[model samples]
Target: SGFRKMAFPSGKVEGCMVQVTCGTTTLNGLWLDDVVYCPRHVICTSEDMLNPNYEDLLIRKSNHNFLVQAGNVQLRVIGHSMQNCVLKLKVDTANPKTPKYKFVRIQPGQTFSVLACYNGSPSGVYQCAMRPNFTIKGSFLNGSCGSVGFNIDYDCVSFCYMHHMELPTGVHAGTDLEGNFYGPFVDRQTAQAAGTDTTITVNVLAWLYAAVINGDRWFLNRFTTTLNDFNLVAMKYNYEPLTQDHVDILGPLSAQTGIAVLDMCASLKELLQNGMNGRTILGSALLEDEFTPFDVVRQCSGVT
Candidate 1:
């Protein structure tokens, strides 16, 4: 709600240390401008400031760690230290970082949690986040297996990322080596043997779709018609690739077109059932196949 910005005197330079103390019995929480510092149990330090969005910074005051609530002024601590000042910073948890740290949309049956190491398991990279994100810092059950994977497809103007796992699969399914998705946007660090050190905020979803829904309708129709012609001709069994009259028709693209058209209809039906309420499906999600390269065509056709 209310946060403070750094207002150091002109002479104050970097590396200077200041002491911050909290005497508020209200036990709300300490906010330093954009970041939130909750001194409930663990002590927050400068290291915790890496995430400028909603990262929490904790401190110790009187051995019993507590939270600060009212009359809080914030400070933007960068290359500086706090010693004994009672700084009250307001926590604003509503704001979301751009395409990188925030989800475009959240679909049903998918889940996300704070980035953390799971069961102290070996750290593995997952290409699950919409973009490259934080490294795994701390450890706790936190209700997650700690492993995540997602497939990301983005063109020049639009972006799409989705959790690429089925529900109820558990750790084994998520940890697969050659799954559909791509990186450990949030990587688990195996070197740390003790406690969880870092964390990143992620709003996970099963399907994170985005694109111009209405733009590609005719394109798909035209494509399906042409492919239908090829299929009809190929049915003659004499319209062979070797025949000059056949004009180099290939089976791979035609077969993939069949799959892509089916997927398109299914995806459109889903959107229609949802009433098109400010939602979108990824162009690639609807048409991409091993041979089709649907991902690359989104921009050219203006579906993206």
Candidate 2:
């Protein structure tokens, strides 16, 4: 892969990442699915991540190629269990002349082996030249308690510094970089430094509530982390003699709803497999608004 020097309209060399040409296509950076897809560059913060909506005003008129600042992101579409529901990922194709539109229907147990690949050499920007500008929308239809949704898994192998395109010391590269099947995200230190604690635990609880009730299978990248965190909380309850505030919250939710923190992962899976009736575990109306685990616990069993 070869890259050519292309100046950004901002005239700020430090802010720009890279620019290049590949056969009939010109590459810089592109926005897909509401997120910027910058080939293999390492993106740490907004300083290096160019937003198509805001940078280099002068270049928008002549060429529409993306301006790569940093890249280190990849996405995977796992599967969906929709009932009387329709969900899809619509993308704009890379036709040299007239771009075409295509969609990938999201269905049960379906997996896009390489939904969006950015596993090329980390030093150069080269994709299949397949422009992916997509949107996903879901809705419930026809009185079946039916709903539409999607499941996605993401893994950002390394968390390079904001400006440097290299991983921090001691951090391991993601699976894609190391020649293995794509798996969970591998960057922990950065994520940890970003931070977690009761409001945090509650937030996790709320997240689980949303996933199980809405039938969403998103953010699987941190499943292991979630498992660990929840178990640690359980340990705290048994030994640390957790703070009263924490105990009060978890205990009431546990006794009244029968939904244990540890069981949420299972509950969510069951919800997806059992379909609309799964809402029964939370005793929530199919169309209920978002809830805190505390709000919904009394409605069902800790067994969920």
Candidate 3:
């Protein structure tokens, strides 16, 4: 903790007038005067030198990408030319410089491959990698679809975003345009598409149950109650909106496996079972109503 003090030799220039010191330590020779000094510091490990965080490796294979994966939907970032970099991915590059690049996230010593990619369509590209992130362009997807919004109530936080319904592939029923939980949208195609990915990191039940368990505990209304709320509502739901709004939140958030999707669907259904456990039979009827927002989120969440 002795990392403090400007080493400018009191009133004179000493040690490198070009460098400040924390007991003779400086973050390299590039910084000096007008720099705040912390004293109890010395030595530069591969870590400290890495800056914000170190990425020992980052790359993209010929078969994969991120956020709606290069080919369906997926970060470890290892830098190459820069000390620190942001990992990004996407399925299209038609407007490469136009802000289509989706940012990626991976811890130190992590690898990204095809299993990390997502399918965009018949003529889309799937790629992934860590690159020098630039701030010039704000965002491509947000520019295309629209910003994300959320509808929160005693029920849940319905993710809000722009959906390309015309595409007619990835969407499911419920959680309508206004972002309430209720409706009728079939998903034979989505479930079929979801069948394509058999890749799941952890147990399917464990992964999704995490969301449900947390979803249940969330203060039927409030900012945050715990990490579970953070994952389902705060962190996961709270973020830059997906331009492709209709991209099933569970599809990408879940294991992306058929079983996972099925369970996410089941977990949602189980919740209604919970809601109606001791309620009037009329409550059960409402659950089936293609017009109730509460019923809608469940119908949409399981949108195969």
Candidate 4:
């Protein structure tokens, strides 16, 4: 192994004096120039290197001709879930010939990995760059039975200052129709009653209402208010009720509806999971409360 230099457009070279010290002492008569810049240099020789290796161990060292090109230069950017919403990159150099670049789009809440390659030979004065600039949309909802004449629709809300997947660290409250709520779980009875003649609005509202009463206040508030607002706008004219048949006619409507609820739950759960102070009008203390014991007596007493 030998010393190599990597140059950048900013008149800088990463590891201006990177030396590859091979343990072999025999001068195998191989040209040091040829052996030094071999593809093996590009191979990830060390697991500890931050960048990917590019060595081709399969090729015989004697037959290989190492030629580093400017295009051999490589760059990579990775993003974990919610770490950053968008990725940006800028390359600045005096060369008129711009290097070809490729990009990859990743799904939300999914891991994203990418590889950029450029010729490392004639690599003098070149720029390789990337930046994460993820964009995210958030929403909030609240509901009450009074059918208030107001638009509940809210464009994607911004809670950027709030930590990712964290519950808002503030006190919030909302009211709902008076009734003994049945569930944080689904009300199978009602769904069965609706049967083939199910009403989307009613079913959604029922679940949301239950969620609100069962300590999922934040979720209930957002989902209920938004749905109510949607109903108001839809009912302004001769709007038709959404039923199972309507869903059937729409094809996959049920799936879409379920997806919406699932997304809402995911968002809400993520928020709540991050820790926040919530005041419950009814119910035992939060599971996180150190004073709240698991015994039946303590549970019945509702003491924290």
- Per-prediction TM-score to the true structure, in the order listed: 0.20, 0.20, 0.15, 0.16
RMSD of 2: 20.3
Badly placed stretches (over 4 Å) of model 3 are: 1-54, 59-304
Model 2 bad stretches (over 4 Å): 1-116, 119-166, 169-304
Instruction: Judge candidate 2 at residue 14 and give its lDDT.
Output: 14
User: Every model's Cα RMSD, please?
Assistant: 19.5, 20.3, 24.1, 26.0
Tens digits of per-residue lDDT, candidate 3, 1-304, equal 1111111111111111122112222221110121211111112232453342223222222212111211111211121121211111212222211211122232111112111001122111111111111001112221112111122232232222211111134322111223222222221123222112111212222223333433432212222122233224212322222112222433444432333334343343343334434433221322221112212233335332
lDDT (Cα, tens digit) per residue for candidate 2, span 1-304: 1111111111111122222222222233222232222222221223323432222322232222222223343322222111111111122322122212122342111211111112121222111110111111111111101011111122111211111111232221222211121122222223311111112234234445544444443322223224555445435432122233544555554453455544653343333334454333233333222233443342333221
> How do all the candidates rank in terms of lDDT, highest first?
2, 1, 3, 4
The sequence of per-residue lDDT tens digits that candidate 1 reaches over residues 168-204 is 2122112221222222321121221222211111110
For each candidate, the alpha-carbon lDDT, in order, equals 0.24, 0.26, 0.22, 0.22
Candidate 1 ranges beyond 4 A from true positions: 1-33, 36-105, 109-122, 127-256, 260-304
lDDT of 4 by residue, 1-304 (tens): 1111111122112221112112221110001111121112222234412332222332332221222223334222121111121101111222233222222232111111111112221112211111111211122121101110000012211111110111132211111111111112111111111112112232233233233334455533233224344444335422224333322332232242343433433333333444335643224232211110111112222333
Q: For model 3, what is the C-alpha lDDT against the true structure?
A: 0.22
Number of clashes in every candidate structure? 27, 10, 34, 29
Alpha-carbon deviation at 94 in model 3, angstroms: 6.7
